[PDB]
Amino acid sequence: GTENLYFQSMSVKGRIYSILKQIGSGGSSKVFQVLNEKKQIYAIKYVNLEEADNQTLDSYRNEIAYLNKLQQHSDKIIRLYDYEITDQYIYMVMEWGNIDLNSWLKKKKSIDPWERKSYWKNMLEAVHTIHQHGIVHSDLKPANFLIVDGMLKLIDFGIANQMQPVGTVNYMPPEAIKDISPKSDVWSLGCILYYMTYGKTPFQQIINQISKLHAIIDPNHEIEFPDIPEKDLQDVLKCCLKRDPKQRISIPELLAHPYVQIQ
Ligand SMILES: CCc1cccc(CC)c1NC(=O)c1nn(C)c2c1CCc1cnc(Nc3ccc(C(=O)NC4CCN(C)CC4)cc3OC(F)(F)F)nc1-2
């Protein structure tokens, strides 16, 4: 009713799209569920550039170049079918998903270990691909993963500068708080998998943000890893959540880990 839009429409590279409903918003951006002339479903991401400075415009141009390139490198990265860039906006014709990983983790009280593992593999493949091109996301959270036919797709690369018209610290690595390295993404992914394992992020129980920030960097604040039937899973978590990035496990090391390899 009030969630669904009527008689609305838009053009991207001359091709006409019917706007069904608005499925997202963040900053000066909107995401719409659309149909093309062939009745195929897509997500059009609209970005408003009217108040963007040259540095911000460049951050959007750089992210689009990378997303259009790296999609041929891994199916764990969202499809970018087409885009229209002008001085006033960006319209990006993307792959449509039923739900994002944040919303889905909020619904599901219990996640299947086979499903949790499949999800882990998808996230590792997506992040591994962007690291191979010199990109460290540095702001990974479950909201950055779209579920498309039971498979996770990474939505963005963290390159673009979010425009102020919020951001959780729960996934922030200790080295980020101290101030960049692929290991920063390993910590954040670790927090996502810890949520899929224990039903919460490692520091979710701490209400005060400053207490939480000191808890992430404190070497004497021991992170609890309750015993679970999957000992390989427990080892992954312990290895991702090492406060020294130099001692923390690497993505190529995680891809050869028994948790991901041993049936
Ligand atoms: C534009 C904002 C932005 C800026 C910077 C960075 C990023 C990446 C995170 C982004 N954000 C984005 O770029 C972005 N945000 N969303 C939400 C989508 C995108 C791009 C592709 C895309 C494709 N399909 C979807 N679909 C849906 C995504 C999430 C939900 C959802 O939240 N469902 C909830 C279920 C529970 N109930 C109670 C509440 C709703 C439902 C969806 O499917 C639908 F079509 F059916 F609706 N979303 C997106």
UniProtKB/Swiss-Prot annotation:
Phenotype upon changing residue 156 to A: Loss of kinase activity
Binding, ATP: 23-31, 45
Residues annotated as transmembrane: none
Highest taxon of source: Eukaryota
Tissue and organ expression note: Present in rapidly proliferating cell lines.
Residues forming the catalytic site: 139
Domain Protein kinase, chain residue ranges per copy: 17-260
The protein's role, per its UniProt record: Involved in mitotic spindle assembly checkpoint signaling, a process that delays anaphase until chromosomes are bioriented on the spindle, and in the repair of incorrect mitotic kinetochore-spindle microtubule attachments. Phosphorylates MAD1L1 to promote the mitotic spindle assembly checkpoint. Phosphorylates CDCA8/Borealin leading to enhanced AURKB activity at the kinetochore. Phosphorylates SKA3 at 'Ser-34' leading to dissociation of the SKA complex from microtubules and destabilization of microtubule-kinetochore attachments. Phosphorylates KNL1, KNTC1 and autophosphorylates.
Quaternary state and interactors: Interacts with TPR; the interactions occurs in a microtubule-independent manner. Interacts with MAD1L1 and MAD2L1.
UniProt similarity note: Belongs to the protein kinase superfamily. Ser/Thr protein kinase family.
Name of the protein in question: Dual specificity protein kinase TTK
Natural source organism: Homo sapiens (Human)
Organism ancestry: Eukaryota, Metazoa, Chordata, Craniata, Vertebrata
Part of the full-length chain shown: 519 to 794 of 857
